[PDB]
Paper text:
V-ATPases consist of an integral membrane V0 domain (also referred to as Vo) that functions as the proton pump and a cytosolic V1 domain (also referred to as V1) that catalyses ATP hydrolysis. The V1 domain reversibly disassembles from the V0 domain in a luminal pH-dependent manner.
In our cryo-ET reconstructions of ISVs, we found both ‘intact’ (that is, V0 and V1) and V0 domain-only V-ATPase assemblies in the ISVs, demonstrating that a mixture of intact and V0-only V-ATPases exists in functional ISVs, consistent with observations of V1 domain dissociation. Refinements resulted in maps of the intact V-ATPase assembly, again consisting of three states all at 4.3 Å resolution and a map of the V0-only V-ATPase assembly at 3.8 Å resolution. We observed the glycosylated mammalian-specific ATP6AP1-binding partner in our maps. This finding was further supported by mass spectrometry experiments, which only detected unique peptides specific to ATP6V0E2. The luminal parts of subunit e2 and subunit a form an interface with synaptophysin, and electrostatic interactions are involved in this interface. The confined membrane environment of a synaptic vesicle, including vesicle curvature, probably contributes to stabilizing the relatively small V-ATPase–synaptophysin interface.
Residue numbers in the entry:
A (entry chain c): 413 to 451
B (entry chain g), C (entry chain h), D (entry chain n), E (entry chain o): 6 to 155
F (entry chain j): 105 to 155
G (entry chain d): 4 to 353
H (entry chain p): 599 to 641
I (entry chain f): 5 to 90
J (entry chain a): 389 to 667, 712 to 829
K (entry chain b): 3 to 204, 206
The structure:
Amino acid sequence: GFFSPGIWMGLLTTLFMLFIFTYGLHMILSLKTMDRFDD
Amino acid sequence: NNPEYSSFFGVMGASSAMVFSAMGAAYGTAKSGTGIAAMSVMRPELIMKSIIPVVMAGIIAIYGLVVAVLIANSLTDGITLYRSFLQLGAGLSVGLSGLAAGFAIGIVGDAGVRGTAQQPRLFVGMILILIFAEVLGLYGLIVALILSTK
Amino acid sequence: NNPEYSSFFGVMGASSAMVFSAMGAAYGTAKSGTGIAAMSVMRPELIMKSIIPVVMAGIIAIYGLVVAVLIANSLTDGITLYRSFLQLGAGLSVGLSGLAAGFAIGIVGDAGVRGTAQQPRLFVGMILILIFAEVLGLYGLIVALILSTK
Amino acid sequence: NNPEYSSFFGVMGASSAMVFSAMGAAYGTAKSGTGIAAMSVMRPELIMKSIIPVVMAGIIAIYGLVVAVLIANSLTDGITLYRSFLQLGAGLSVGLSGLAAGFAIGIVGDAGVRGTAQQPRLFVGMILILIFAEVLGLYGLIVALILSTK
Amino acid sequence: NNPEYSSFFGVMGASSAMVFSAMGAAYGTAKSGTGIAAMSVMRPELIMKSIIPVVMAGIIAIYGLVVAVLIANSLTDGITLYRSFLQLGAGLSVGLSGLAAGFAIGIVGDAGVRGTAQQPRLFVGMILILIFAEVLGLYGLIVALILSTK
Amino acid sequence: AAGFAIGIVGDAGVRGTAQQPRLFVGMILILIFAEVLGLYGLIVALILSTK
Amino acid sequence: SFFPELYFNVDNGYLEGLVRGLKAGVLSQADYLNLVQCETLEDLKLHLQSTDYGNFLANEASPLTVSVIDDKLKEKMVVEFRHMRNHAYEPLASFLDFITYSYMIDNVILLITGTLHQRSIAELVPKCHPLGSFEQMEAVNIAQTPAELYNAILVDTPLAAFFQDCISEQDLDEMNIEIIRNTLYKAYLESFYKFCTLLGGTTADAMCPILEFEADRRAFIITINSFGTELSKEDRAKLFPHCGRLYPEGLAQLARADDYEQVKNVADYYPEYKLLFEGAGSNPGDKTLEDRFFEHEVKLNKLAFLNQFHFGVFYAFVKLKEQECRNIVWIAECIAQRHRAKIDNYIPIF
Amino acid sequence: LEYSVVFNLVLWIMIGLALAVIITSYNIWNMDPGYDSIIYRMT
Amino acid sequence: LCCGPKLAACGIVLSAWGVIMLIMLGIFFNVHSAVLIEDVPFTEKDFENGPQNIYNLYEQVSYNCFIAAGLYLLLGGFSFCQVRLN
Amino acid sequence: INPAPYTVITFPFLFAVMFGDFGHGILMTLFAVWMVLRESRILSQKHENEMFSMVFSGRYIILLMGLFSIYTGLIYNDCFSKSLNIFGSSWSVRPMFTQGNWTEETLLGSSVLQLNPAIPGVFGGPYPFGIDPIWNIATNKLTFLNSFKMKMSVILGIIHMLFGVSLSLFNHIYFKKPLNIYFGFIPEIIFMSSLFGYLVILIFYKWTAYDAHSSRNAPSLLIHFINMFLFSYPESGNAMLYSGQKGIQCFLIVVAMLCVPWMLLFKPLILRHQYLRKKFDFGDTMVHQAIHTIEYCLGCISNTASYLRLWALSLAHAQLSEVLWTMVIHIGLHVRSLAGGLGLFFIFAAFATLTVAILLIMEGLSAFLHALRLHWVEFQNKFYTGTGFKFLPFSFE
Amino acid sequence: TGLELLYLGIFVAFWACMVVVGICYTIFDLGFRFDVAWFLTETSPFMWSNLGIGLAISLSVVGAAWGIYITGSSIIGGGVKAPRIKTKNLVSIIFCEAVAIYGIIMAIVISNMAEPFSATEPKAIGHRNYHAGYSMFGAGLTVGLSNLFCGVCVGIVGSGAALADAQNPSLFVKILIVEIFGSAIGLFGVIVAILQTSRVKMG
Amino acid sequence: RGNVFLRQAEIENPLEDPVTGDYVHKSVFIIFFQGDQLKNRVKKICEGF
């Protein structure tokens, strides 16, 4: 077989964690800094 | 008896409790720093006044650490799948509640520093909203404890 | 008695704890240097007042180094699956925590360097924020040294 | 003598026959709105004269409704793969043809409604276009009928 | 006796049936509230007269709930696969139809609020458009009902 | 990787040397390091073609 | 779950609230009725204290004159806008830059046309708008040919991008400067329209009509102004914007115009332009075309303020408040001329 | 036997390496010279 | 003069707190022998013989409440002296 | 009704409900006394720190909540993560456990934990001194602690909410508005009581009646509540709580449902009746009334649901105190003979500073603001209209 | 488009590969190895159950955080020139956190019925266990997503209300109705979740 | 176009402002030419600074 039950379990769990991680990574990676200072 | 895959999932939970939550805190701190810059030049006397958001980010980190230690002491070789998935669920939930709270505090802290830079009376108001951010993290932590028994 | 692929997870940790940690440092020293480039002109004598974020980045790199070395030092051919999962979890957690800490230190350093350039008294307060980012680094290390033995 | 999962495809057909078609209708109406109000600001008397594309979208929805009702009525527990596949095909065809017709009707209705506010003689010509976009949906119905009776 | 995995399809059917309808209602109400809040500054004395699209948006949530209640009530631990596939089909159909109706209602109410602010006479015309959105969602309901009692 | 480095550096340096001839000789030095990088990419492969 | 509304505030929530608060500072009809009864400039300042504009004349203006009033109003403008700018991230920053390009072009052409007359060399600074100040505002005094003007503007002033390949001339007389103005404004409008349509979302929907109207307004103005002058018709055809609703007849009917009758016969074809031109009948007692154009402009900006997450609430806002300044000035002018005959020529807002 | 293990191993390692090289090369190809002095100026 | 009280009063409060809590810990570890409810940790691995070892080692652990507190006993006295220097 | 005399004592009580720890109570009280005793000196002084000014403004609240924190921590029996053991445990004596067929099972127990089933027939005993101390090392303390906190928080919230809502009747009679009390507050109170006083009586009933020997077959309260909410009546799977459940439960739910139409419909009809008797947009009147009524119903459900922050904060405090004890200065227990207290010096210095910087300052602030939020929203949105103006005196400045 | 190109590429490639393998299996007469039964049975229900438990508060907290920040930025931005609205607009954040309260109570309800077993083959685990696991996972997903979208909706409407209220101070009383109509769906999801998980009897 | 040359120097002490009194930074520059046309044309640039 191309898969075994434990493999499917681990794959689904890792996929969930990976989706959550890439969401967080997108949000942090869009951060930008200011250009000039006041006064 | 139990499969050998069983030890995997539970351990992974611990990692989440020290990745996701931590990451949220990180964002928060960074954003707050930018705010301080925009406020430092014009109203220099209130630099230490704005110590309040950054600590309120670090607390999220603290929460993660707590749960991590717990899931480093309940781990044993002979773990059934039931325990493993309980622990994975706890780790996932606490990490994500930390992340969401971190994003909220970061944005609110930027807005708070910028608002106080032009209106002292806004100070108290910002603090109020900040509380509603931090408490969210605690909610995640709650189920972690509920998942160390059932 | 135990499969050979048991080695997998273990040494992947021995890689990852290093890898991601380095990435964090590559953001801490870089963007801070870009900020010091602007700082150098208006007041070239504040380089000692702006060398903080780079030392922070080096510190987090050392953290990654020590966890990676310690985990690698516990390698053997007949390693049990349990130990392998433990090492992978510890390594990944410390690596990603280091990455996040590096991001935060870099952003705040770039802000505060020029903030101090325009406004001298910011300087001391700037250090405060950096320390809190550094705390996150500590926390990652803790979990690994809680997962090395137990 | 027949598997029961053969029923699956058939029910899916019903869903499509009312799902994709429905979507098309919705889109059409929305587009009409962004014309109709935009036209009433200067020439209110024309409002009742610009409802036609919406009724045509209504007919587009009605097509999907009738075909879905027929398809659902045909269903039974002991269906051979033949009838189930036929139902699936009919539903998919009518649903997506209705979707395309609704999309065209929506863009056409917006453009024509905006246009007619300046040149009244456009009116009759506009309606010609509308019918040439309605018959599209009609053709979907035809093929579905040929699949339901057979 | 039926196979062991019978209830999965019915459960997921009910879940999707509520979830998609809630999505549509949320979008519709958010957009309608945006329009109302934008419009209130100019002509506040018409606020009660313009909340109608929100009231119509609630009906999508009502449709989702009624299908969910029926479909959960019919469920049992030992249904046949034919029934569970009817369940899944009905759930998908009502959910998607509700989503489309929500999209239409939101955009149309958005245009219509400003349109009515421009000219009162638009109002009755707007109402007609609203009906031709609402009934679309209604059609979906009845189809699902024939699927659920089959 | 060598191609990327050579392309970017060559563009910037060629556009720069359009105005100041003295930079020209210096340009070659940078390019030399780029070549050296490519050389490493060959060398490893060579050993893996005999081991 | 709309396309553009989920992520707007994450970095543009504070400034949006600040600008929306500042939009309450426009004076309604009641304040204008109140302010039209002032008896002297000191009376005007006393009333101005009680409104949101209060406390910007605590100086030693014992001989108060309209010059100080205008200067303080513009100072409030520039300080407010600069503070708004200095707290913005990259997209909003490009937006506000695009706004200030207009005043930059205006100042550059003001300075070149001033120095075209050798009688003034360095006393032209106080007249230029402080908002449109770039590092090389004084290089204009070294340009003898427009190529040298390009060489001065090229390095840091981004206006180069608007005329880098649209001007090819070697002699700098007093006629071509109008061509420079028209071409630069043309490129600016085109680039701004392209940027707006790229930005996508509700900003495009809520700002396309404004730019379209501005394009047609400038087209009509340049057509009417060039009736009885040395400007050739093909050059005029080479100066219209291409972002309005007059695309076909702009290049196929306006260029073939020679008196006001044909412009009327082209403007009457559309509803809104027909109404606008009929309202401005050019009678002795009726307002000129410019006043009607300003009225439509203010109407469009006022209508544009009914969308929550639309970037142009900044751009629109600035334009609106600028008009307000003009209004106040006119009132004070009557108080300087000691007659209230034409004091009602103001154009109300909100 | 153990076909699933080796297959998943090869697949995920290969996907990781390919995605890494693709994204990094995309970053390198898109980079800014400057269009600042050397490049901006003409004539 | 040297070590003004402005940066040392917190030191005095901390020293007072330390000495009081350390005396409390020592007293409840010695007299009450630190009943296991108030103390998990101990110092041995083989305790299959009898109770003499547990109480003996509990006394040894409580004895360690000495220099601990004594350390402050002094540090507080030094910090008060620095406070006095005006 | 000025809410000062209520809040002035219900704020320290609530803070104590979310600050269940005694040593930290002593620390906060020492802080408060330090600030208070220097009243004359500080007021006659030039200060600059704004934190110091706000804290000196709130010295009264700080002192009161420190004093209450002391008591609530004492009943918590959690002083610095340990239990003040008065040594009145009555749980396990050896020959009693051997009487219950249990001897030398620790041999296999050297690697397992061995929960004991309760009630061998010779043990029990509540504790007058708050919470029995033995829980502080029990590995299953979390379950009973959480159950206790759940029930604690819900019960206190319901009673405090009843106190909040019961005051409006006073003002209604005071302003002489009969239509707003007869057909006003009465349906509100009957609805709230019939819904939630039922939960209170049921929970006390489960606490008091079901003995240990009936552990199996014991019911779940939430299942019962949901069952009556959905009107489902299974004949098996859960046993009735007490005799006559069906009639009483059904009657309470139907009267609760029948309470809504009064407030929903009746009063505006009467207003229109008197207006017509005289001869006022009646549609507007029923619109506003109906909005108010649905807002009350949904809001009261939300407020009753929002009371769990008490449990949340108490649990966070418990866990944080345990970890702060057991991670850093737990290492102080060691084997060294001469150089041990030396290390303990720095270890406790670090521990004290860290608890100062983690719990005494910032999380306490979060708890205090949560108490404030509870004192505002779920309290004063029942009777406090909040629409007036204070004085802007002409006192010179 | 700056980096979402990667996401679109992954999505399209994944679905194209899925279609290709599906048709390849179908025309090869090799459908007997596409056993959905094997996947649904040999995966222990505990993984589904704990995924549901986690999600039921994951999504609720995400929605609550989204709502609080989207309303917070606007309220504080408007308060800079209108301090009178600072305290008045607490109700939006109250409604935003109400969804988190609902999520956590749902987690408490679902968390019960978690009795471990010792079966190892599907016949031993049984229909009741499989139904319980699937049903409670579905209920968790439903409550999570419903609360998420309710939170986003109420956050948006609260932002609009707060922005509008700074202008004319007699407008707040005519915009909470949309807020309540938003909270309705957040409650609807909860009650449907209860209706789903009513009859779980795992053991 | 490089036909002239420039060299700069700067004073570490900041320099008082006649108008505002500020200790704003200042610096000195020396420029060398080759002819009189440069002496003429350069003042237009120099007076802008």
